[PDB]
C-alpha cells in the first residue's frame, strides 16, 4: 500500500457534512490539519493552488515509474550504456530531501545543520567512522550549490533513485574502474558531477521535450488521483472568499489534467449539473515560472483559451470573467483580487519553493500538501513504541557503552520501516532538514489539503507559543 | 542600573571553586548558561573568542553615548546642522536589532517574518491602522537589502538612536518639509537613504578613522568592564582544550585591551604570578575580516609584535609560540589547531554574524554573549507576572471585543519595563527575529561567557528534542 | 546575380597552378587577398576552418529564403497573425550589420563611433531632421546589448528583414495603434522588444529545433556552394602545416555537409582518388561553442563517428588519428598541434565572433571570407566614379549650400546600386562598424578563402604601416 | 630639458593675435593641433575641460619625485625595508602606457594586439628569446585585468618607477630568494602580486590621504605650470560658446588650484582688470567620479563654497550664477548647458578614462592633450633620419639575415633617444597601444590645449578618409 493508494482510499468516499460526522472525522490523524502556527481561518479571503503534486497527485509507485523509464531511455538514446535498460524502478529506495554530493557520488540525508544522517554511496551505505575519510566534520555546507543538489520535490525521486543505480553500475562494471570523484575508462573519465549534470539534463528533456505528458494524459486514471470531494471543497472556499489557481504548467497540459480531475457526473455534490473546472476559479495564471513568480515575475500574458497559444502582447486590462493569464507575478494576484498577503492561503507540495518562497518574499499563508505523509503517518502510528524506546534511551544515557549500540539499532530499525532511506522526517531521534523547513515555513501541513473539508468555515488553527529557553 | 552595571557587580565578586558552591550559583537565572541545542562539553577540543563586546564588554551607557558624540561631530563636521550638536544620547530608546526602513524613514521592531511589531517615526509610535498606509500587509521583505538595514549590532546602539533623532529634527525643523521618503528644502532633496547612508557612513569612519578607540585606550576604567575571574577562566579552558581569538580588530587596539583585561597584581587566581594576555591563546589571529573569514578569508599574515605592523609576505609555516597571525579563514584555525568544526566552541556576540555564519558555514559549536541579557533578564522576571497574564488572556481569546484592548494594554505595559523600542526578545507574547536568530544559531547563551566556570569540564548541556506538530 | 552565383561561377572553373596563371590570376579583384596587416604566410604553421559560411557557403538568396520562411512559420505556430504567411523574402532590403533599436523599432546603420547613418522604421527611411526626434545626438551606445541588437552574421539576414516586415505590418494593420514603443490592441500591449525577441527566439528554434537543417541536407546542390578547388588548397595547406575544423555544428550536420564539399569523382585533383573528408583535417572539433571556446570552452569530449554520440566521459588523451572532438577550448587545439596563436591563420566569416575573439583573446592570425564581397566588389568597381565624384565634392566643400544637397544625392544614388541598406562597408564616403572591424580584426579578408590558392607557399602579405597625424 | 619646461617656456610667451602671425605661430610643429578625425569648430557649443594634467600640468620631474618619495614613505610606514628610502625617482625610465605583469612581475610595452615590444624584469630588460620562456606567443590578453594592470596615466609614472626599483631591489637583496612569482622569506611569501597591491594602495592614499595635495599646493611655481595666455583662450571661447569643468577633484583643491592658475596682475589680457577662476565657467562640476560619470554617475549634490562643504540634499534645481556642482553625470552637462554631445568638445589628458568614454558612452568630441609630447615632438623631429632609415630597411628586408641586426640596432638607438622605455607612441617601426587609442577616440590632440589659441574661431580641422585595403 503506497501513499496514493491511501489517498485514492480516501477519495473514493463520499462526503457526510454533518457537523458531529465532521468533527470525529477530523480527529482521526489521517484526515487532520497539523498546526505550525495560528491561522484564523476567517480573516483568509483568498485561496490559491498550485496543480502538480498539490490537486493532481500522481499515483505511486506508477507515475515514477514512469518517469525514471523516460530518463533512463533518454540516457541510452544519447550514449548512455544499454545495461541502463535493464535498471527497473524501486520505491523502497528514495526518501524525498536527499542531498546528492557531485564530488563524491553520495545521497546524503542531512539534518537542518547539514549534519550527516545517512550516507549511501550507491548502494552501500556507509558507517560512521568510513563516512569521516570524505566528511571529517560528518556536516556539509549545504548552500554550496555548485557542489550539493537538494533533490526536494517529488518529481525528483526517479532520479534519486536513478543516480545510486548509476553510481552502482559504474562501481560493478569492469570496463570502469572507480577513482574518488567518478568514473575512468582509459582516456575518457567520467566525473559524478558530470554524471549527475546528463541525468538532471535528462528529466528536464523528458518533462519538458519528452513523452511524459503524453504518456500521462493517456492513461489518466493510471496515473492521477481523482476525488469528487475536490469541487466540493473548492465550491465551498468560493462562498467565503475567491479562488485562483497558479501554476508552473502550461494551459494544454493544465486543462487535460483539471478537466481529468472535474470529470464526474455531477459538478460540487451528486445530483448537481458539472460545471467547468474554469468556473470553480476567480484567477487561473498558467506559465507562472515559481519561485521567480513571487520576485520580479515575467511579463503578463493572456491565454487564447481556443487555441491555447497566447495572444500577442502584454495584458494590461482587469480581471474579466473566462480570461486565463499566463506569467505575470504574485503582485498580479495581489492586484487583481484586492488580496494583501496575509488575506492569503496559498496551498501547494512545492516546500522549498512556493512555499518558502511566498512565505519569506510575500507574507502569504500555507499550507503544505504532504503526499507520502498519509503512509508516513500509518508507519509513525504503528511504530511509535520504537519511537518511545528511543526517546527513553536518550533520556537515560543523558543522565549517565551498551547504550549506544542499543541506540543504533532502534534507529536503524525504526528507520527501515519507512523503506532505505527511512523517514522523510528524521533518522530516529534527529530530524532531518525537510521536517524542519516544513515546521519554519508551512503554517498548516497535511497528506491532502482536502482535509479542509472537515474545518468548519471560521475555524481557529491553533499553535502553543514558542519560548526560548530563559522564559519557560 | 545598566547591564554592564549588572555584568561589572558580578565581576567584582571573586571565585569560590567549591563544588557545592558553583552548583549553588549557577542555580540562579543569572549565571546559567542556557540551551537551545544539547552540549557535551567533552568533545569540545577548542575554545574560540571574539574581542569586541566578548572579551571586552563595554560600558553602557557611556560606550554608546561616547560612539554617538563622535558620529554626531562627523556629521556636523561634513555639513549637517549646528543645532545636531544639542542631541544627547539617550539609552531608554534603542533595542538592538531594529530595522531602518531607508524608504519611508521608520524604525521598525519585527518577528522572524517580517511582521511589523512596533514602527516609529522620528519619536512617533505609529499605532496599527496608520501603519497599514506604508505596510498595506504590515509586512517587510527583510531581505531586501536596498531597502531595509538590520541594526543587529551593539556598536549599532548609537546610530539607531541617531536615526530617530535626525528624522525627529528635521520633521520638525521649521528650514524643511516633510515628504513621504525625505524632506525638501528648496531646490535640495535629503531622501531617508541618503540621510541614512551619512550615518552609517559616519559611525564607520569614528570607528576606522576618528577619535574613538584613542578616546577608549586613554580611560579604559571608564568604559570596558574586568573581571578578574576571566583568566580563571581562560585558564582552565587551556587545562583541557586549546584556546584561540579569532577579532576583526587590529594588533595594535587588541594588544591595548586585552591587556587591560588582564592587569591584575595576580595571574589566574589571587597569589598566582601576572602572565601576559598571549600566554592564555594557542593561537592569536586579529584583522579576521568575518564575516568573509568563515568562507574564503584572506590572505594569512604575520604581526610583526615588536612595531604592530604586518611582516612582508603571505605566512606559508607552522603554527609557532609567539606568533600572531593576520587575516586568514577560519580553516587556518582548524588546519594548525588540528580541529573539526565540532571540536570548536566559538564565543561572541554578533549572532547574525560570526555565530550564525561559523555555524552554517562550518558547523562550529557556539556560544552567544548577549550584554543586555544581565538586564532583561532582571526585567523578565519581575514582570513574568504581567507576561503570565498576556498568556492567559491569548488563551483566553482564542476560546472564544474588550479581551483585544486588554491585550494591547498589558502588551504596552510590558514592553515599557524594558525601554521604548521594548524587550530585544519580543514584543508582548510575540517573538523578535533577533529571539529567533538566537534560538536557531546559538547552541548556548548567556549574557558573559564567565558563566562557564559555573560548569564542570565535562558538564552535558541538555535541551529538549523538537516533535513536529503530527508526532507530539 | 548574387554573390553566392558569382562564388559558383569561379567554384565551376578547373585550378590552372601553373606559377604564371597563378600570377596572372591573383592580379583580378576578385581573386585577390587583401591585407590590413602583413603577414609573412611562411610562418604560418597551421590553418584552421570554421565550417557554415566558410567552408560551406550557403546559397543566396535561396538558403535566407528558406530560412525567412521557416521562421514565419514558427511565428505563425506560436500565435502570430495568419497575414505573416504573405510575406516573402526580398535580398535587395537587408545588407549585414545593422542594428536593431528595440525601443523604437529602428534599423540602423552606424559607423565605428555609434553615428547613425540610415535609419529605417518598417520600410520608411527617415531623413536626417526626423531622425533627431528620437536620437538627438545622431548617435547610440551600441554596446547597450539590453537596448540595441547588431545583426552581423549571415544567419541573421532573414530576421533583418522580418524585423522591417513585421514592423510594416504591425504600422498598417488597423487592428493595432501605432505608439512610440509598439503597438497596442486594446489590453494588449506589444513592445518593438517582445516582438524582437519573438522574431530572435523562432531563428533560434528554426536552427536547432525545427527543420532547417533537415531541408538543407535534403537539397544540398540547391543550398551549398560547390568547388573542386577545395580540396586541392586544403591539401596543399597540409604539405606545409596541419589543418584543423573548429565548428559549433554537431557531427552528424558536419559530416553531411563535409560529406557534400568533397563529393567529387576524384580527390585533390582530377585523376586522383577520392580521400574522404576527415582525410584533410589533423584535428577535426565539432559543437565548439565558440567565442566562449576562445576563453573557459567547454569540457573536452570525443564523439563516436558510428553513432554520432558523444562517448561517456571527459577525453583526457593524445591527439589520435581518426578521434574527433567536441567541445574542449582553443588551448585544445593549441596543446594538440603544438602551435602558439601567431603559427595560427584561423579562416571564418563571424568577424565580430570567431575573428575578433581569436584576434583579441589569443594573438591568432586571421582571415575573414565575406561572402557578399564577391558581389559588393562587382558594384564597388563599376560605381567607381560616383564615389571618385563624391571625393571630390567633399574636398571641394572643405575648401569652402548647393554642394550639400549633391553630396546627399550622389551619396542616395551610390548606396542604392547594393542595395535599400547600401553596401556592407559604407553610406556614401562614411565607413561603417562592420568595415572598421575588419580593418581591425581581419589581417587577411576576400571574398573566399580559395583565393589563397593563387599565392604561393612562403608568399609574403604586405600592407603599409600605419602612421599618426605628426609623424606623416 | 623636461616636457614640462617646454610648456613653461611657450607659456612664458606673450599672445600675438595679429593673424598673420597665429597662422606662422601654428605652422611650427610644436604650436600645432593634430587632427585624427574632422572636426568643423563652428559646431562646437560647449567646451569642457578636465583639470589635473590638462588645465593644471604638473611639473617634470618634481611632481612625480614628489609623488614618488610619499609613495615610499608609506610603504615604509606601514612595513616595507629602511632601504626603499635610498631609492631615487628616475625621469629616464617610465614611459607611460606600461603594462604591469603582476604574475611575473614585469613592466610590458606592448601594442594594440597586445604584442610584446619591451620586457623588463626590474632592471633588467629580457631579450626576445629569453621572453618566449614566460611569454610564449609574445602576446598578452591585456583585458585580463586580474593579471595585468596598464599604467596609463601620468599620475602613474612615479609607481612604474617603483616597480620597477621593488624588483630590482627584492632580487638582489640577499635575504629573499627569487621565485617565478615572487620571493621567498623562510615562511613568508611575497608574490609581485601582493607587492603591486600593497604599491597601488599606497599611491591612492598619498593622493587621497596623505600629504601630495598639501605639499603641491605649499609650493605651486615649484610644481604647477602656469600661462598668462589661459585665461585669454578660456575667454575667447566664452565668447563663441559655453565654457565647463568636470573634474575628478574636491572643490577645495580644485579652488586653490585654479586660483593660482589665474593669479596675474591683469585679467584675459594685460591691463584688463583680474576676474575670478570661476567667472570663466558657465558650469563648474567637481568631485566628477569619471568614468562612472559617463554612465548612471552619481547623486547631484551642490557645494557650499563659503564652507568647502556639500549642502544637504540632491540638488534638483536649474542652473544658477554662482552654483557650484558635485558629482551628477555627463547628462548634467548636457541638460543644464542645452548641449548635445556632439556640440560638445571635451579637453583632458585621460585617453583611456575621459576621452574613450565620453566618446564610446556619450559621442562627445575630443581633445586630448598630451603633457610629454612637446618633448616627444623634440625627439621625434630630431631623429627623423634614424626613423627614415628604419623605414628604408623595413621596405627592402619585405622586397626580399644582415638587415634583421641593423633593424634591431636601429631600432634600439631610435627608442633610447626618448628614454629607456622609448618613446610613447612606438618602439621601432612598431606602434604602442596608447598610439593607436590615441589614434582612435582623440579627435584632436596636442601637447596643450593652449595650441588652440592659435586657430580662428569656425577652424575647420581636416583628416583624410580611411579606405580599406580594396577601395584604395
Redesign the interface.
Known amino acids: 500500500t503506497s501513499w496514493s493508494d491511501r489517498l485514492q482510499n480516501a477519495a473514493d468516499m463520499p462526503a457526510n457534512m454533518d457537523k458531529h460526522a465532521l468533527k470525529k472525522y477530523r480527529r482521526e ?1 489521517y484526515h ?1 490539519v ?3 502556527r ?1 491561522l484564523a481561518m476567517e480573516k483568509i479571503k483568498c485561496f490559491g493552488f498550485d496543480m502538480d503534486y498539490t490537486l493532481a497527485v500522481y499515483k505511486s509507485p506508477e507515475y515514477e515509474s514512469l518517469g525514471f523509464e523516460l530518463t533512463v531511455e533518454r540516457l541510452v538514446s ?4 544499454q545495461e541502463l535498460l535493464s535498471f527497473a524502478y524501486d520505491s523502497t529506495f528514495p526518501t524525498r530531501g536527499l542531498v546528492f554530493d557531485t564530488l563524491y557520488g553520495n545521497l546524503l540525508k542531512v539534518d537542518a ?3 550527516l544522517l545517512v550516507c549511501a554511496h550507491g548502494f552501500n551505505f556507509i558507517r560512521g567512522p568510513e563516512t569521516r575519510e570524505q566528511y ?4 556539509i ?1 549545504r ?1 554550496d550549490t555548485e557542489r550539493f543538489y537538494i533533490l526536494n520535490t517529488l518529481f525528483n525521486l526517479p532520479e534519486t533513485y536513478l543516480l545510486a543505480c548509476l553510481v552502482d553500475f559504474f562501481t560493478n562494471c569492469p570496463r570502469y574502474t572507480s577513482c574518488e570523484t567518478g ?9 559524478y558531477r ?1 554524471m549527475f549534470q546528463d541525468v538532471r539534463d535528462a528529466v528536464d528533456w523528458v518533462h519538458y521535450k519528452g513523452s511524459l505528458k503524453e504518456k500521462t494524459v493517456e492513461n489518466l486514471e493510471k496515473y492521477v488521483v481523482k476525488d469528487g470531494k475536490l469541487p466540493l471543497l473548492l465550491s465551498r472556499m468560493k462562498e467565503v472568499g475567491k479562488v485562483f489557481l497558479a501554476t508552473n504548467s502550461d494551459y494544454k497540459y493544465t486543462d487535460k489534467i483539471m478537466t481529468y480531475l472535474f470529470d464526474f457526473p455531477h459538478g460540487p455534490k451528486p445530483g448537481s449539473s458539472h460545471r467547468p473546472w474554469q468556473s470553480y476559479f476567480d484567477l487561473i495564471l498558467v506559465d507562472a515560472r515559481k519561485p521567480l513568480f513571487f520576485g520580479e515575475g515575467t ?1 503578463l500574458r ?1 491565454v ?1 483559451t481556443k ?1 491555447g ?10 480581471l474579466q470573467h473566462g480570461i486565463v493569464y499566463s506569467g505575470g507575478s504574485s503582485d498580479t494576484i495581489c492586484d487583481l483580487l484586492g488580496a ?3 488575506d492569503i492561503l496559498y496551498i501547494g507540495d512545492h516546500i522549498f519553493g512556493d512555499i518558502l518562497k511566498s ?5 502569504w499563508r500555507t499550507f503544505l500538501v504532504i503526499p507520502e ?1 498519509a503512509q508516513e ?1 500509518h508507519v ?1 502510528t504503528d511504530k511509535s513504541s520504537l ?1 518511545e524506546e528511543l ?1 527513553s534511551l ?1 533520556i537515560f544515557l ?1 543522565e ?1 557503552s551498551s547504550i549506544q549500540r542499543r541506540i543504533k539499532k532502534v534507529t536503524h530499525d525504526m528507520d527501515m520501516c519507512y523503506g532505505m532511506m527511512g523517514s522523510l ?1 528524521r533518522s530516529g ?1 534527529r ?1 532531518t532538514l525537510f ?1 524542519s523547513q ?2 519554519r515555513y508551512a503554517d498548516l ?1 497535511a497528506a491532502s489539503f482536502i482535509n479542509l473539508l472537515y474545518y468548519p468555515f471560521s475555524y ?1 488553527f ?2 502553543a ?2 519560548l ?4 519557560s
Do not use: C
Not at 544519447?78 to 550504456?81: A, M
Not at 497559444?309 to 482587469?318: A, D, E, Q, S
Not at 512565505?359 to 507574507?363: L, P, Y
Open positions: 490523524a487532520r497539523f498546526v505550525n495560528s544519447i550514449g548512455y550504456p545543520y547539514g549534519n571529517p566534520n560528518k556536516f555546507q548552500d568514473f575512468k575508462d582509459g582516456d575518457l573519465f567520467m566525473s558530470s511579463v493572456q487564447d487555441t497559444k497566447l495572444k500577442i502582447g502584454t495584458y494590461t486590462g482587469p494583501k498577503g496575509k512565505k519569506k518574499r510575500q507574507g505523509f503517518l509513525w519511537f526517546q536518550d543523558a549517565l522526517f531521534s530530524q521536517a516544513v515546521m501541513y481557529l491553533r499553535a507559543h514558542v526560548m529557553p530563559h522564559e
